[PDB]
UniProtKB/Swiss-Prot annotation, chain B:
Localization: Mitochondrion inner membrane
The species this protein was found in: Ovis aries (Sheep)
Keyword Transferase: no
Main subcellular localisation: mitochondrion
Topology of this chain in the membrane: Multi-pass membrane protein
Family as reported in the entry's similarity comment: Belongs to the complex I subunit 4 family.
Stated name of the protein: NADH-ubiquinone oxidoreductase chain 4
Membrane spanning residue stretches: 22-42, 60-80, 98-118, 147-167, 196-216, 224-244, 256-276, 284-303, 308-330, 351-371, 391-411
Taxonomic path: Eukaryota, Metazoa, Chordata, Craniata, Vertebrata
Length: 87, 459, 70, 177, 101, 128
């Protein structure tokens, strides 16, 4: 019960959830892609993406922290520091 | 009672002749030996009192109080031997001398055959408690508490002296046995009104009665642990024993006299308990719990029914032991965190499991969990007062809520929740503290099996 | 696997206190209960009998258990 | 309102907070996934109706009326995540988060059964007590007159320097002890 | 200005650092162990155990059990001679002189 | 339309419905900046006194001691006997006492009068 999670699995799952988005493409999606600068999306898209990961990982990320999760590596960093990976 | 006074008078040079490192061990050993020998007073009868001579006697009422007193003194020496480790040798020996003198004074007071001897010994108990409070207290304003305590006691007890000398000059004696056999009814006159007031107000002061209880929330806080224990667990019961002795002499006026005073408790023990709902100081909360229990004792003694008497003495013994244990718990937590604020130290169960268990046991014994002695006493008081009148069950029943509503509250904030971050000096439990709390608790749970020796003189 | 050290308060002191408390209780509890059961089994209880004419017993003869009589 | 770094919430932050809370409440009221997706698309279209606005006062009481409508149409029992405050599992294992400094109070008999871990803890304590002086030296100069204005802390600047006030964040207890 | 001369606040004494097996009694270990021995012997082994033995074996306390035995006689008398179970007068009414009115 | 929130003593107004939160005036900006600076200074002082390796003890909180002394010992030096305090003391200090005394005197007089005329059922009441 309660299997542990590894950081490679964390970025695999985050890229999996990102790669199913219809306002994104699975070609130029990378782990160091800025959402509006290097990818070209909206702030509404940003908060909705944050809500999508909040539904995916089963816990609530506050808005003060949610405004700064701006790249997939930063989302992986926040999940990593929240869930205490590499123990 | 010359088999117990002389051992204390020999304990006095025993603490004036030991070395600077062997006073505590020798005093503890010999006081525990005297506590072991204290059980010979249990040779009682259901119809007669154990009389030794013309000056000392002991029925089934004073005997549990004596046993509690000279069982509490070794516990006092254990509880007060750490925060005085920095003191001078002469002052340490003086502290032990005051404690030994106080124990001798109490065991001479509880066995006084005649009432004038009881009165003078009762006022003589003032001196070491006042000295301890005004000398070894911690806070700044301890002088105000000592002055308030001394003046409340003296202003109560001097009309008691005048009434006692008037009674002795009127009838002829002050022996309790003679007054049991030479009692006279007091008619409903204003002279007998002021006689009842003069004979009662001293004990209502030292119980304390609600309204005159203001000397308790100060003198129970700024005093050290030994002074707090001797104020909480003995002297209130000294006043109760005095009131029990005196109320035989004041019939049948009390049946129409005690209407305000009883009800001065019958509401007061409500709102004072409500004060424990909104207290930031733990020791003040314990003192107000003692106020509520002594108000229940006041009601039980003043209605003068037998079941009320049994409930009064049982609740006296149980509340004395429980309040001493709670004061020791407050002193230990204050020693660990250097503050008496209740909201400061939180989450102590995650750091101190055994101390949390002792906190749980003390709080459970405070809320009258059956089959402990406190439940027996308070239940007997409730039966007697319901025999007195019906609606008063409400005035007890709501108290049954509020007591729990603070006691478990005292259990929650100090033990349950996220622990404080900046407090990182919580040492593990000392063996001395655990020994002291087990010595407080285990006699109560053992007397829960056989309560028939602490149910009063008329069982 | 991946065993992690469970951070806990020091449990030596309370366990030592409980152990020595149990030891010092039992070191006198066992001999007194052995003496009590040997009094009950070997010495035994008393028997009720009516008072004979011309005998005035001592006070401790008015009780049943040998420990109470002692 | 009450934020650690900023002294106020701007209009964009208020709009995004309203959007996220509206999506959470709409997901609570629309339990089935397809109904929730349809009404989330409808709510996104409604939000994009007034996205391109040029008057700040118009956006102000439009946000006021939108918040009033969201208050009227909220779920009385919104869905709360187990780890979020107000949840069923909120701060439960916080009862088992024993702090690390209690390990300094252990007996030497029970310290001998974990030798290597306590040696590494001693090394970490030495590192903390040698980094405290340079971290407070860094924080003294970087602080302007009147103290810091924001709650944000400066990072490590020089090589070999640890960030200031790092012990009670790095050595915080784990989520699952 | 400066106030009156006074020492700074002395810190609290952590007893476990100077002695890993101390017990909050005294600095030296031998007198501390002696204090532990005397408290656990004369506090639990001597007074508590023998006290429980003593209170468990009081010699028929307050004669109360004896009273039950006396009751075991008395009704046995009053169920033999046909007397009523218990008189409603504690004393003999033939030795009472009421105040005449 | 909608049912407007009416705040009470036990039901506070929601924070997002406050008009004062929607004010963009300069004075509110300097007030927010000043309280943020005060909070940052206090937080900096706390974590400076908190992360010290040399310190092993209680970090003193002046606000807690201030609150305890305001609650406990500073209530009587700042008391003035006026008509409001006198009325609140007369309504709450002696009113319940005289009310309880009157109702209990009436009940006990009724019980004694019923008992002395031999009508109360006291046949099996031998414990008192």
């Amino acid at each position: 019960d309660a299997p542990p999670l590894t950081l490679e699995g964390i970025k695999d799952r985050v890229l999996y959830v990102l790669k199913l988005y219809d306002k994104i493409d699975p070609e130029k999606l990378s782990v160091n892609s800025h959402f509006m600068k290097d990818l070209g999306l909206d702030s509404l898209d940003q908060v909705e993406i944050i809500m999508a990961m909040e539904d995916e990982f089963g816990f609530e990320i506050p808005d003060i922290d949610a405004e700064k999760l701006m790249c997939p590596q930063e989302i992986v960093d926040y999940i990593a520091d929240k869930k205490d990976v590499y123990e | 009672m010359l088999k117990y006074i002389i051992p204390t008078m020999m304990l006095m040079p025993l603490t004036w002749l030991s070395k600077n490192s062997m006073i505590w061990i020798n005093t503890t050993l010999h006081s525990l030996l005297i506590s072991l020998t204290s059980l010979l007073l249990l040779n009682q009868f259901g119809d007669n009192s154990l009389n030794f001579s013309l000056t000392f006697f002991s029925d089934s009422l004073s005997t549990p109080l004596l046993i509690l007193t000279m069982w509490l003194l070794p516990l006092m020496l254990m509880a007060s031997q750490h925060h005085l480790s920095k003191e001078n040798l002469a002052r340490k020996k003086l502290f032990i001398s005051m404690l030994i003198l106080l124990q001798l004074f109490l065991i001479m007071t509880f066995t006084a055959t005649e009432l004038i001897f009881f009165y003078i010994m009762f006022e003589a108990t003032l001196v070491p408690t006042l000295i301890i409070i005004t000398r070894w207290g911690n806070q700044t304003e301890r002088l105000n508490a000592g002055l308030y305590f001394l003046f409340y006691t003296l202003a109560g007890s001097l009309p008691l002296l005048v009434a006692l000398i008037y009674i002795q000059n009127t009838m002829g004696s002050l022996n309790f046995l003679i007054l049991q056999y030479w009692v006279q009814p007091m008619p409903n006159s204003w002279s007998n009104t002021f006689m009842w007031l003069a004979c009662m107000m001293a004990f209502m002061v030292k119980m304390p009665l609600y309204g005159l209880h203001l000397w308790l929330p100060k003198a129970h806080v700024e005093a050290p642990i030994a002074g707090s224990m001797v104020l909480a667990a003995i002297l209130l019961k000294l006043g109760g024993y005095g009131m029990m002795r005196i109320t035989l002499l004041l019939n049948p006026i009390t049946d129409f006299m005690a209407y305000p005073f009883i009800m001065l408790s019958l509401w007061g023990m409500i709102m004072t308990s409500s004060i424990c709902l909104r207290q930031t100081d733990l020791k003040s909360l314990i003192a107000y719990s003692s106020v509520s229990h002594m108000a229940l004792v006041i009601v039980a003694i003043l209605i003068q029914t037998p079941w009320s008497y049994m409930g009064a003495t049982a609740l006296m013994i149980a509340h004395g032991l429980t309040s001493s244990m709670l004061f020791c718990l407050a002193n230990s937590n204050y020693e660990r965190v250097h503050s008496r604020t209740m909201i400061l130290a939180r989450g102590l169960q995650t750091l101190l499991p055994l101390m949390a268990a002792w906190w749980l046991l003390a709080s459970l014994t405070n809320l009258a969990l059956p089959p402990s002695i406190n439940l027996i006493g308070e239940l007997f008081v409730v039966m007697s007062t319901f025999s007195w009148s019906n609606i008063t069950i409400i005035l007890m029943g709501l108290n049954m809520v509020i007591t729990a509503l603070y006691s478990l509250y005292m259990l929650i904030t100090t033990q349950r929740g996220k622990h404080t971050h900046h407090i990182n000096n919580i040492l593990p439990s000392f063996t001395r503290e655990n020994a002291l709390m087990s010595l407080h608790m285990l006699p109560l749970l053992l007397l829960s099996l056989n309560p028939k020796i602490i149910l009063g003189p008329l069982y | 696997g991946k065993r992690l050290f469970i951070i806990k308060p020091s449990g030596f002191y309370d366990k030592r206190f409980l152990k020595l408390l149990r030891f010092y209780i039992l070191l006198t509890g066992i001999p007194v209960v052995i003496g009590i059961t040997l009094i009950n089994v070997f010495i035994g209880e008393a028997e009720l009998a009516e008072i004979p004419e011309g005998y005035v017993p001592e006070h401790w003869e008015y009780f049943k258990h040998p420990i109470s009589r002692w | 309102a009450f934020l650690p770094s900023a002294a106020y919430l701007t209009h964009q932050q208020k709009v995004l907070q309203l959007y996220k809370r509206a999506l959470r409440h709409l997901e609570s009221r629309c339990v089935h996934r397809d109904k929730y997706r349809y009404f989330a698309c409808l709510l996104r279209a409604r939000f994009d109706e007034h996205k391109n606005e040029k008057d700040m006062v118009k956006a102000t009481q439009l946000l006021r009326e939108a918040e009033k409508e969201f208050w009227h149409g909220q779920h009385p029992q919104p869905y709360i995540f187990p780890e979020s405050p107000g949840g069923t599992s909120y701060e439960r294992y916080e009862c088992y988060k024993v702090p690390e400094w209690c390990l300094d109070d252990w007996h030497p008999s029970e310290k001998a059964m974990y030798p290597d871990y306590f040696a590494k803890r001693e090394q970490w304590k030495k590192l903390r007590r040698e980094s405290w002086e340079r971290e407070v030296k860094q924080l003294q100069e970087e602080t302007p007159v009147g103290g810091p204005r924001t709650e944000a802390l400066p990072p490590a600047r020089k090589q070999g320097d640890l960030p200031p006030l790092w012990w009670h964040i790095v050595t915080r207890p784990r989520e699952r002890p | 200005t400066l106030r009156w001369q006074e020492d700074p606040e002395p810190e609290d004494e952590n007893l476990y650092e100077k002695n890993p097996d101390s017990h909050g009694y005294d600095k030296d270990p031998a007198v501390d162990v002696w204090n532990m021995r005397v408290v656990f012997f004369f506090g639990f082994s001597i007074v508590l155990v023998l006290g429980s033995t003593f209170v468990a074996y009081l010699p028929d306390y307050r004669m109360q059990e004896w009273a039950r035995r006396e009751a075991e006689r008395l009704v046995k008398y009053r169920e033999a001679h046909g007397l009523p179970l218990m008189e409603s007068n504690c004393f003999d009414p033939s030795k009472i002189q009421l105040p005449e009115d | 339309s909608f049912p407007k929130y009416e705040p009470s003593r036990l039901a506070s107004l929601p924070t997002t419905l406050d008009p004062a939160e929607y004010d963009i005036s300069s004075e509110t900006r300097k007030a927010q900046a000043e309280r943020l600076a005060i909070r940052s200074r206090l937080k900096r002082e706390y974590q400076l006194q908190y992360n010290d390796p040399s310190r092993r003890g209680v970090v003193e909180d002046p606000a807690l001691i201030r609150w305890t002394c305001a609650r406990s010992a500073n209530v009587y030096p700042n008391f003035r006997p006026n008509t409001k305090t006198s009325l609140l003391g007369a309504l709450f200090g002696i009113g319940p006492l005289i009310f309880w005394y009157y109702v209990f005197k009436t009940d006990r007089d009724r019980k004694e009068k019923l008992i002395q005329e031999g009508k109360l059922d006291r046949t099996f009441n031998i414990s008192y």
